[PDB]
Structure 1
Amino acid sequence: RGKLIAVIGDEDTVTGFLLGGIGELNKNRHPNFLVVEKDTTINEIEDTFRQFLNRDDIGIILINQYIAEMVRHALDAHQRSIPAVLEIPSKEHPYDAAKDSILRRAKGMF
Structure 2
Amino acid sequence: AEKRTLIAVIADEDTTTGLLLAGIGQITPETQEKNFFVYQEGKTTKEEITDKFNHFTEERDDIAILLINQHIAENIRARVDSFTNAFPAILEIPSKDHPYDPEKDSVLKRVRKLF
Give yes or no for contact 2:15–2:96 (8 Å, CA) kept in 1.
Answer: no
Residue 108 of structure 1: CA displacement? 4.5
After superposition, the C-alpha distances for 1:59-108 in whole angstroms (9 at most, x for unaligned) are 21111110111111111111112210101113311221122111011125
Secondary structure of the structure 1 residue equivalent to 2:72: helix
* Corresponding residue number in structure 1 for 2:91: 86
* Corresponding residue number in structure 1 for 2:103: 98
Distance in 2 separating the partners of 1:99 and 1:62: 13
TM-score, length of structure 2 as denominator length: 0.85
Distance in 1 separating the partners of 2:7 and 2:34: 12
Q: How many residues of Structure 1 are paired with residues of Structure 2 in the alignment?
A: 109
Looking at secondary structure, tell me which structure has more strand per residue: 2
Of 32, 35, 39, which residue of structure 2 is paired with 1:32? 35
Give aligned-pair identity as a percent: 52
Secondary structure of the structure 2 residue equivalent to 1:99: coil
Unaligned segments of structure 2, at least 5 residues? none
Distance in 1 separating the partners of 2:52 and 2:26: 17
Distance in 2 separating the partners of 1:78 and 1:41: 21
**Which portions of structure 1, spanning 4 or more consecutive aligned residues, are displaced by more than 2 angstroms?**
none
Distance in 2 separating the partners of 1:29 and 1:98: 36
* Corresponding residue number in structure 2 for 1:67: 72
Of 52, 56, 60, which residue of structure 1 is paired with 2:61? 56
Structure 1 residues 54-63 or 32-41, which shifts more?
Answer: 32-41
Which amino acid in 1 is paired with 2:11?
Answer: G
Of 4, 18, 21, which residue of structure 1 is paired with 2:20? 18
